[PDB]
């Protein structure tokens, strides 16, 4: 199934932020009504923040999140969660070798802010 797609509210403001656990340099690309609007790129075994971000949802308010290593798509695990029907978590993993800790890349999306 896909994953790493996201439909938010329109015309809302929304954090996007990367860790990186792997010896590949990620990099994480944000588009937003199928452009990109963030790219983030960093190495880090120890989940360092390689990039945070505020971005608009525009008035279609789809978020996709694509993590590519070496130019080679990493393979995506995702879901949204919602607390108190109010707060909400985009969550993306990725993979990038073989060993299927699927951390190599992982995107944090969080709304609203403020
Ligand atoms: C390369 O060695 C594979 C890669 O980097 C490792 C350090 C580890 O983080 C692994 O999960 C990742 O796919
Ligand atoms: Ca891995
Ligand atoms: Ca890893
Ligand atoms: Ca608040």
Redesign the pocket.
């Known amino acids: 199934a896909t994953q790493g797609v996201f439909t938010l509210p329109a015309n809302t403001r929304f954090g996007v932020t990367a860790f990186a ?4 340099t990620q990099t994480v690309n944000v588009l937003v009504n199928n452009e990109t609007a963030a790219t983030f790129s960093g190495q880090s ?1 120890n989940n360092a923040v390689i990039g945070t971000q505020v971005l608009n949802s525009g008035s279609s308010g789809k978020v996709q999140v694509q993590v590519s290593v070496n130019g080679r798509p990493s393979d995506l695990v995702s879901a949204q969660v919602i607390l108190t029907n109010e707060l909400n978590f985009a969550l993306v993993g990725s ?3 073989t ?1 299927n ?1 699927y951390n ?1 890349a992982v995107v944090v999306i969080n709304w609203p802010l403020g």
């Open positions: 656990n792997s010896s590949g075994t993979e990038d070798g060993d800790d190599d």
